[PDB]
Design a protein around this motif. Structure first.
Motif, PDB file in Angstrom:
ATOM      1  N   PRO A 118     -23.258 -56.081  67.639  1.00 35.07           N
ATOM      2  CA  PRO A 118     -24.450 -56.096  66.776  1.00 35.07           C
ATOM      3  C   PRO A 118     -24.158 -55.730  65.331  1.00 35.07           C
ATOM      4  O   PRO A 118     -23.237 -54.969  65.027  1.00 35.07           O
ATOM      5  CB  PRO A 118     -25.358 -55.023  67.402  1.00 35.07           C
ATOM      6  N   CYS A 119     -24.985 -56.278  64.441  1.00 40.53           N
ATOM      7  CA  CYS A 119     -24.948 -55.918  63.033  1.00 40.53           C
ATOM      8  C   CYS A 119     -25.415 -54.475  62.860  1.00 40.53           C
ATOM      9  O   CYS A 119     -26.007 -53.892  63.777  1.00 40.53           O
ATOM     10  CB  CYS A 119     -25.820 -56.877  62.225  1.00 40.53           C
ATOM     11  N   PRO A 120     -25.143 -53.868  61.696  1.00 44.05           N
ATOM     12  CA  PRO A 120     -25.508 -52.454  61.512  1.00 44.05           C
ATOM     13  C   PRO A 120     -26.996 -52.194  61.594  1.00 44.05           C
ATOM     14  O   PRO A 120     -27.397 -51.125  62.063  1.00 44.05           O
ATOM     15  CB  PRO A 120     -24.954 -52.130  60.117  1.00 44.05           C
ATOM     16  N   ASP A 121     -27.835 -53.130  61.147  1.00 47.46           N
ATOM     17  CA  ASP A 121     -29.272 -52.907  61.257  1.00 47.46           C
ATOM     18  C   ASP A 121     -29.725 -52.932  62.716  1.00 47.46           C
ATOM     19  O   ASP A 121     -30.579 -52.135  63.122  1.00 47.46           O
ATOM     20  CB  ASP A 121     -30.034 -53.945  60.441  1.00 47.46           C
ATOM     21  N   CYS A 122     -29.154 -53.818  63.534  1.00 47.69           N
ATOM     22  CA  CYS A 122     -29.532 -53.801  64.944  1.00 47.69           C
ATOM     23  C   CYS A 122     -28.946 -52.591  65.664  1.00 47.69           C
ATOM     24  O   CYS A 122     -29.566 -52.070  66.590  1.00 47.69           O
ATOM     25  CB  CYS A 122     -29.128 -55.108  65.631  1.00 47.69           C
ATOM     26  N   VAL A 123     -27.796 -52.083  65.219  1.00 52.30           N
ATOM     27  CA  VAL A 123     -27.296 -50.826  65.771  1.00 52.30           C
ATOM     28  C   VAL A 123     -28.316 -49.716  65.576  1.00 52.30           C
ATOM     29  O   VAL A 123     -28.568 -48.914  66.485  1.00 52.30           O
ATOM     30  CB  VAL A 123     -25.951 -50.446  65.129  1.00 52.30           C
TER      31      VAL A 123
ATOM     32  N   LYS B 269     -32.040 -62.373  58.444  1.00 51.40           N
ATOM     33  CA  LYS B 269     -32.704 -61.096  58.638  1.00 51.40           C
ATOM     34  C   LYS B 269     -32.694 -60.709  60.119  1.00 51.40           C
ATOM     35  O   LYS B 269     -32.671 -61.578  60.994  1.00 51.40           O
ATOM     36  CB  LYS B 269     -34.136 -61.158  58.106  1.00 51.40           C
ATOM     37  N   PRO B 270     -32.713 -59.405  60.423  1.00 48.20           N
ATOM     38  CA  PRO B 270     -32.513 -58.972  61.820  1.00 48.20           C
ATOM     39  C   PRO B 270     -33.581 -59.467  62.780  1.00 48.20           C
ATOM     40  O   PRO B 270     -33.324 -59.523  63.991  1.00 48.20           O
ATOM     41  CB  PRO B 270     -32.517 -57.439  61.720  1.00 48.20           C
ATOM     42  N   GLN B 271     -34.756 -59.858  62.282  1.00 46.84           N
ATOM     43  CA  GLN B 271     -35.766 -60.452  63.155  1.00 46.84           C
ATOM     44  C   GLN B 271     -35.240 -61.691  63.875  1.00 46.84           C
ATOM     45  O   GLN B 271     -35.709 -62.019  64.974  1.00 46.84           O
ATOM     46  CB  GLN B 271     -37.020 -60.812  62.350  1.00 46.84           C
ATOM     47  N   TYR B 272     -34.278 -62.391  63.279  1.00 48.73           N
ATOM     48  CA  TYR B 272     -33.707 -63.586  63.879  1.00 48.73           C
ATOM     49  C   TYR B 272     -32.523 -63.296  64.796  1.00 48.73           C
ATOM     50  O   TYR B 272     -31.921 -64.241  65.313  1.00 48.73           O
ATOM     51  CB  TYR B 272     -33.263 -64.571  62.787  1.00 48.73           C
ATOM     52  N   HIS B 273     -32.163 -62.036  65.004  1.00 49.83           N
ATOM     53  CA  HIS B 273     -30.943 -61.726  65.736  1.00 49.83           C
ATOM     54  C   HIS B 273     -31.197 -61.649  67.231  1.00 49.83           C
ATOM     55  O   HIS B 273     -32.286 -61.284  67.674  1.00 49.83           O
ATOM     56  CB  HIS B 273     -30.342 -60.409  65.248  1.00 49.83           C
ATOM     57  N   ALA B 274     -30.164 -61.996  68.003  1.00 50.96           N
ATOM     58  CA  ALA B 274     -30.266 -61.984  69.464  1.00 50.96           C
ATOM     59  C   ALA B 274     -30.691 -60.618  69.984  1.00 50.96           C
ATOM     60  O   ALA B 274     -31.472 -60.515  70.942  1.00 50.96           O
ATOM     61  CB  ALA B 274     -28.919 -62.382  70.076  1.00 50.96           C
ATOM     62  N   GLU B 275     -30.168 -59.554  69.378  1.00 47.11           N
ATOM     63  CA  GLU B 275     -30.430 -58.200  69.847  1.00 47.11           C
ATOM     64  C   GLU B 275     -31.900 -57.818  69.676  1.00 47.11           C
ATOM     65  O   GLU B 275     -32.460 -57.104  70.513  1.00 47.11           O
ATOM     66  CB  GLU B 275     -29.532 -57.212  69.086  1.00 47.11           C
ATOM     67  N   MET B 276     -32.534 -58.265  68.588  1.00 48.19           N
ATOM     68  CA  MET B 276     -33.965 -58.039  68.408  1.00 48.19           C
ATOM     69  C   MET B 276     -34.806 -59.004  69.237  1.00 48.19           C
ATOM     70  O   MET B 276     -35.906 -58.632  69.666  1.00 48.19           O
ATOM     71  CB  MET B 276     -34.333 -58.145  66.925  1.00 48.19           C
TER      72      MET B 276
HETATM   73 ZN    ZN Z   1     -28.656 -57.643  63.817  1.00 46.65          ZN
END
Ligand code: ZN
Length: 184
Positions: free
Chosen positions: A90-95, A56-63
């Motif tokens: 970045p993934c589409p959700d982080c975009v 999930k995007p909460q775990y992504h570097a960008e977030m």
């Molecule tokens: Zn992401």
């Protein structure tokens, strides 16, 4: 919460610019936050985040970066220039989150230089990075000078030099052409 530098093994394992690359389930994100106003260009903060490419995007570097930046660099009125050196785009959700962030903070500009392109789906391929670029972010492929700059500033190089991969040049050329197509 961010680190200062990564070790040499980590840098080599994660920033190799092979377009097709398996097993790199993390995204490493090197950042510079600068206060920028024409010819003034002050280095303000630097560091390194690691996150997941998937989950999930909460775990992504960008977030990870965005949560740290809002909590620790904002509130502030300064003109910020944010530079990222990232192992994946970045993934589409982080975009979407980054595009929203940029549209609400006109005093912030973001540049993303990536070692490799995220594997976008058919629907996201010509949409995700295009949307981010349309919100004003500069999205580019990391070139040799940027790899060397990262080796100097974000790697515990311990005096060693950066030794580029043998396929560096043709990998860069393929990635630059693919991104140009993705952005129109
Ligand atoms: Zn992401």
């Amino acid at each position: 919460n961010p680190m200062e530098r990564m070790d040499r093994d980590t840098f080599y394992d994660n920033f190799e610019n092979e377009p097709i690359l398996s097993g790199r389930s993390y995204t490493w994100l090197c950042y510079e936050v600068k206060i920028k106003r024409g010819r003034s260009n002050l280095l303000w903060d630097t560091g390194v985040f690691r996150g997941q490419v998937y989950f999930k995007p909460q775990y992504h570097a960008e977030m990870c970066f965005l949560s740290w930046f809002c909590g620790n660099q904002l509130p502030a009125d300064k003109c910020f220039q944010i530079t990222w050196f990232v192992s994946w785009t970045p993934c589409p959700d982080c975009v979407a989150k980054l595009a929203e962030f940029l549209s609400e903070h006109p005093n912030v500009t973001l540049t993303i230089s990536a070692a490799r392109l995220y594997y976008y789906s058919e629907r996201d391929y010509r949409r995700a990075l295009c949307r981010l670029s349309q919100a004003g972010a500069r999205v580019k492929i990391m070139d040799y000078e940027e790899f060397a700059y990262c080796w100097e500033n974000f790697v515990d190089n311990e005096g060693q030099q950066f030794m580029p991969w043998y396929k560096f040049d043709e990998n860069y050329a393929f990635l630059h052409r693919t991104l140009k197509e993705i952005l129109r």
